[PDB]
Design an enzyme around this catalytic site. Structure first.
Site: not given
Ligand SMILES: Nc1ncnc2c1nc(Br)n2[C@@H]1O[C@H](COP(=O)(O)O)[C@@H](O)[C@H]1O
Ligand SMILES: Nc1ncnc2c1nc(Br)n2[C@@H]1O[C@H](COP(=O)(O)O)[C@@H](O)[C@H]1O
Lengths: 115, 115
Positions: B33, B96, B101
């Site tokens: 996102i 986070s 993933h």
């Molecule tokens: N609904 C969603 N759809 C796509 N990616 C998402 C999302 N919610 C999140 Br939070 N993200 C992505 O999830 C990732 C979290 O990765 P980390 O936990 O390694 O930071 C971020 O790059 C963020 O943009």
């Protein structure tokens, strides 16, 4: 010459020295020569796969094994606060050595974007 | 509720929408996102493993599968020049979302250090 003909193949065959942290029948882990974090090591397979794009479906377990070892070694080295694993593929990925390897960096806060 | 109770678990169960690129019986791939490169997507397992430090030895093939799918999708999206795969673990890694993933970024030159 097993382990391929790259810098990493010479490390596998013990032709050139390396700070070995872990070794099993499938892979080997050693510290990076140009660390980008307090703790920075590599996990490489003994089998020569030049790059991730060249990995076959049967290589699935071996690729997952590199991560399980990375996780276990990171634990041994005291990375309680976390780390970042990186695999570089090709020119845009920044791959300079053509033998699949996994980077495990920790000991400091990693930033975003990852390069 | 299968797939765990995180943002990613809701995506798995189709509770919240996502741009799905690939899905098989074991994992799912969708665009990030907040992309940090022209092409930036995630590959997540359907099985809930909170973080790489919590992955068990039997999870070896599934972890390697995420990379094989990342490699196949990156091919579908035209990343001929390469890419970078990243797994963030814990606080220092920048995790986070607590559901394992894999990030696959490409479309531009990736720098060093990787964050
Ligand atoms: N609904 C969603 N759809 C796509 N990616 C998402 C999302 N919610 C999140 Br939070 N993200 C992505 O999830 C990732 C979290 O990765 P980390 O936990 O390694 O930071 C971020 O790059 C963020 O943009
Ligand atoms: N003899 C050696 N011992 C330890 N690491 C090495 C090495 N030769 C090289 Br090249 N390196 C490391 O191998 C890495 C290459 O990774 P990329 O191909 O993903 O850039 C670099 O981080 C570099 O420092």
């Amino acid at each position: 010459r097993p382990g391929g003909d790259t810098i990493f193949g010479k490390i596998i065959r013990k032709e050139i020295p390396a700070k070995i942290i872990f070794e099993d029948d499938q892979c080997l882990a050693f510290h990076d020569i140009s660390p980008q974090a307090p703790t920075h090591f590599l996990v490489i397979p003994k089998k020569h796969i030049s790059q991730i794009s060249a990995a076959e479906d049967a290589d699935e377990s071996l690729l997952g094994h590199l991560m399980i070892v990375g996780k276990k070694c990171a634990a041994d080295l005291g990375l309680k606060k976390g780390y970042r694993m990186v695999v570089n593929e090709g020119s845009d990925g920044g791959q300079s050595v053509y033998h699949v390897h996994l980077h495990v960096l920790g000991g400091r806060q990693m930033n975003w974007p990852p390069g």
